[PDB]
Amino acid sequence: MKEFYLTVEQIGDSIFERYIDSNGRERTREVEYKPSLFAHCPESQATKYFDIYGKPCTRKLFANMRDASQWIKRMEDIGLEALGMDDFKLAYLSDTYNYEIKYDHTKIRVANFDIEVTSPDGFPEPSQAKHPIDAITHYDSIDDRFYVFDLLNSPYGNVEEWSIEIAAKLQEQGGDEVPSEIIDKIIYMPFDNEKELLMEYLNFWQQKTPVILTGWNVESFDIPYVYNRIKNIFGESTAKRLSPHRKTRVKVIENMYGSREIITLFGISVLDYIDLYKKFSFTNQPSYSLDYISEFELNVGKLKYDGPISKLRESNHQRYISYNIIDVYRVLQIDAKRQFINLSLDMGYYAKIQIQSVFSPIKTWDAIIFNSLKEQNKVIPQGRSHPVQPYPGAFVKEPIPNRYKYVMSFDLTSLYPSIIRQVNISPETIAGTFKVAPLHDYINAVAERPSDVYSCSPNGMMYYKDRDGVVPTEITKVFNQRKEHKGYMLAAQRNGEIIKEALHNPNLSVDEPLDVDYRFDFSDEIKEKIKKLSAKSLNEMLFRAQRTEVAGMTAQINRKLLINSLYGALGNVWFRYYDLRNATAITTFGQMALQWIERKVNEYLNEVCGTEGEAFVLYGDTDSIYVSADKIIDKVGESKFRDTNHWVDFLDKFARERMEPAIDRGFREMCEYMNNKQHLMFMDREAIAGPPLGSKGIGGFWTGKKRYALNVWDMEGTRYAEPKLKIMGLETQKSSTPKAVQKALKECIRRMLQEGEESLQEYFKEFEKEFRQLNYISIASVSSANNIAKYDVGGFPGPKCPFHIRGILTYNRAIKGNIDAPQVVEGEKVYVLPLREGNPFGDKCIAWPSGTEITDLIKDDVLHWMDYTVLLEKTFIKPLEGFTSAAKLDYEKKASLFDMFDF
Numbered sequence: 001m002k003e004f005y006l007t008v009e010q011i012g013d014s015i016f017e018r019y020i021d022s023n024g025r026e027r028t029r030e031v032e033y034k035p036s037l038f039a040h041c042p043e044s045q046a047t048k049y050f051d052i053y054g055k056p057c058t059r060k061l062f063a064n065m066r067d068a069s070q071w072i073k074r075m076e077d078i079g080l081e082a083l084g085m086d087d088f089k090l091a092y093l094s095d096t097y098n099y100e101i102k103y104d105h106t107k108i109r110v111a112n113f114d115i116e117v118t119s120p121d122g123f124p125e126p127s128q129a130k131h132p133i134d135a136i137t138h139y140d141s142i143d144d145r146f147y148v149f150d151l152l153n154s155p156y157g158n159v160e161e162w163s164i165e166i167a168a169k170l171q172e173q174g175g176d177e178v179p180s181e182i183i184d185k186i187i188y189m190p191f192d193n194e195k196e197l198l199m200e201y202l203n204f205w206q207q208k209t210p211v212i213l214t215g216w217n218v219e220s221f222d223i224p225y226v227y228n229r230i231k232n233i234f235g236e237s238t239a240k241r242l243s244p245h246r247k248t249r250v251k252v253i254e255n256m257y258g259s260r261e262i263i264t265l266f267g268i269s270v271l272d273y274i275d276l277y278k279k280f281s282f283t284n285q286p287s288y289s290l291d292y293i294s295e296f297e298l299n300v301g302k303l304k305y306d307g308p309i310s311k312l313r314e315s316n317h318q319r320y321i322s323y324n325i326i327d328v329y330r331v332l333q334i335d336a337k338r339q340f341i342n343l344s345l346d347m348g349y350y351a352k353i354q355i356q357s358v359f360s361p362i363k364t365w366d367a368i369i370f371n372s373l374k375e376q377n378k379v380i381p382q383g384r385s386h387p388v389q390p391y392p393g394a395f396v397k398e399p400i401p402n403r404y405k406y407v408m409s410f411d412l413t414s415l416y417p418s419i420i421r422q423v424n425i426s427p428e429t430i431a432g433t434f435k436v437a438p439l440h441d442y443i444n445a446v447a448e449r450p451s452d453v454y455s456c457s458p459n460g461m462m463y464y465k466d467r468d469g470v471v472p473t474e475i476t477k478v479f480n481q482r483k484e485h486k487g488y489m490l491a492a493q494r495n496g497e498i499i500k501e502a503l504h505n506p507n508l509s510v511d512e513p514l515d516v517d518y519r520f521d522f523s524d525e526i527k528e529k530i531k532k533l534s535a536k537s538l539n540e541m542l543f544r545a546q547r548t549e550v551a552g553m554t555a556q557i558n559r560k561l562l563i564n565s566l567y568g569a570l571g572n573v574w575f576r577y578y579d580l581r582n583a584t585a586i587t588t589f590g591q592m593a594l595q596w597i598e599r600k601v602n603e604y605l606n607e608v609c610g611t612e613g614e615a616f617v618l619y620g621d622t623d624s625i626y627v628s629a630d631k632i633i634d635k636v637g638e639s640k641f642r643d644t645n646h647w648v649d650f651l652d653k654f655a656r657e658r659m660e661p662a663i664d665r666g667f668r669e670m671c672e673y674m675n676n677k678q679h680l681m682f683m684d685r686e687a688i689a690g691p692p693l694g695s696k697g698i699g700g701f702w703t704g705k706k707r708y709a710l711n712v713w714d715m716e717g718t719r720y721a722e723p724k725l726k727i728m729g730l731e732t733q734k735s736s737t738p739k740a741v742q743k744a745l746k747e748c749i750r751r752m753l754q755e756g757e758e759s760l761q762e763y764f765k766e767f768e769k770e771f772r773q774l775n776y777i778s779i780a781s782v783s784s785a786n787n788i789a790k791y792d793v794g795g796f797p798g799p800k801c802p803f804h805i806r807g808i809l810t811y812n813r814a815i816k817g818n819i820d821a822p823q824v825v826e827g828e829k830v831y832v833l834p835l836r837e838g839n840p841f842g843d844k845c846i847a848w849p850s851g852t853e854i855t856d857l858i859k860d861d862v863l864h865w866m867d868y869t870v871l872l873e874k875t876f877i878k879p880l881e882g883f884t885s886a887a888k889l890d891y892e893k894k895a896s897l898f899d900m901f902d903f
């Protein structure tokens, strides 16, 4: 069993690391690393070791690790360049784990927990943790259990224990609806006081010390709290014990907050699931409240409770404690389906880097290359910060606002990376520079062709078309691995169908499982010996395949990420290999290909249609384009098409046979113009959208850059049952808009695109009427009280103050008299509502903590007072209003000359 690390940390001149040994055991060792470095040597020498420039260098041994540090410091002082890997941890690894990796994972203590503290005012301050923690669920991958610590006594409330069984009941049985398959897997243990509680957890912890720490807002919240709190009632010395190496660092961060600390646990890789999500999600989202994502991801939703989230323990310790768990579980379920954590291992294991350093492309990439060069005997430069220069980003066409019946998209796969390789961009690949003409001309080819020996970029760059550039080759390497691992998972998946049915009537005596490398489809030789096998003898056969297809595919994705998070690191100042000219080269080229191909399209097209000065390319954005099929369709007339679906196939064959061809062909021309290394410019149709045929719906409309919506039918081949709406930046999303409204708007658009104005017009009257009977909450407007509520407490408000904070102060001036039942607003997420003027409150609008109902004393009044008309305008009419205008429509029909007359 070939070993591997877990956590590596550097303190003093010695490393400290947790790893599994040649026979599955998690141990530690404190190794005093003897770092190796380099410096350019006088040319005439004999050596391996030469930088990525030609220049030769010579090894430097430090024995003591911090000598190096003293050395480098020095060199730079003198003015001499110091080469090698400054981050020792990544260096260490490189040597010790020199081979390909192969990690177990079932062997890695991934702890997922979540604490709960009950605070008067719904939010507490992790900063000092004035209050006690009254709940803690702590899952253990290694154990498959959930450890639950409950505090029964508290100045905020002394409660009864919790019922395993009641939790085990259905809603109607006052049950917590808790999932069976978990139930037996709990280990509840209640306490009398906080000390005993923690103290134990501490011990619990010091015993089952995590490698990976997860949660939801675990980093920002849970983790700090703990730490602080402990130190508070126990003191630091003992708080420190939370780290295996019992060492630790506190870090403050800033912004629209101020103190936001993130404790850095020495020797445990912390991966807040939240971040970890946002990165690999590949799905932009509007809010990340746990229960929102669990909805989308598992449909389920969240444990519905009553009263504030601060009341709950007092008002119902039962559910308070159940939910706590559910949370942890929800996450579990997600990792298990999306598999993120697993991925990370793999990834961080691939690049041989500290696991959490997955959140940093710099870190990763750097390490990837470093290791690449290592077994190549070259030497990485020395990083050296440059300043922050505003090179442009990608292009985004200003679109004409209007309705657009038939339309179709196209995507340059990856793009940036492809560019890099299309132009052999890398730092040592930089050959020259040319007199640079205004880009505009270049895209029209009215510029003169620069260099005939060099690969060139529109910002005046020139690159050696010979030498195979570091960056470019390095990426290709990755790209092959994906092309390769993608196939792998296919073979063993499709090699699973093989064992799938030859196990429906398996049995032939009792067999011995076969030595198969599933990675490739079988062979008929092998295929015959399979039918000669039984369900017993097979099955481990079918587990490995379906699982090597699991496994293998994980990596295929891994690359997908890397490949995608590359430009992140290059466009980054701190990235060792960063260079502005390089960076700019990219974005500019990219910026070009877009309008280049955009022009080309139009040409070709209004030519093939034989129309004139007709701009078809309706909009483009970073790496996609939009073409108005409108006139193409009309050429052949709407009449012929007998099925909305009928034409859909049409555009498709067109794209694929007329279009596509012209593109590649037209991109070749560009590559040509640049004397580029190769052709890597692949853009393929990707979406088709429009009104159902016969339907007076408009198919789609735009409002401005990134402000658009449309009726999709085929999503890259995959045709659609009924349509599926693609909204973009239209506040259907923006958290702020009330739910009831969103669900509404979302609908108007559907009507528009699919049905026609009549349909819309009537619906308008609908929700309009029903507006006044809707439950207030579905109509309230959310927005964060980004705690600058402070800045306005001039007793009362004071101009240059927004609606939000206005509503909050006016609120608190009503909550003067608590009864304690009324929560107060602690710097986060609130409600907001109009109020007709001359209300007995002062100000016009109130807001209250999100998720909550309102203290009854004021409650009934508020709403009686509530401003309906206003609310509506601001919330619904206004945004809607926009749409219409852009798409050129009307929500209320023009006051006919013909009214008064009943027909």
Ligand SMILES: Nc1nc2c(ncn2[C@@H]2O[C@H](CO)[C@@H](O)[C@H]2O)c(=O)[nH]1
Pocket: 035, 036, 037, 083, 084, 085, 091, 092, 094, 095, 370, 373, 374, 375, 377, 378, 379, 380, 381
């Ligand atoms: N080839 C190479 N080795 C390096 C570099 N930086 C540090 N080393 C270390 O020097 C030793 C010999 O390669 C190994 O321990 C490397 O991990 C670098 O930039 N290139």
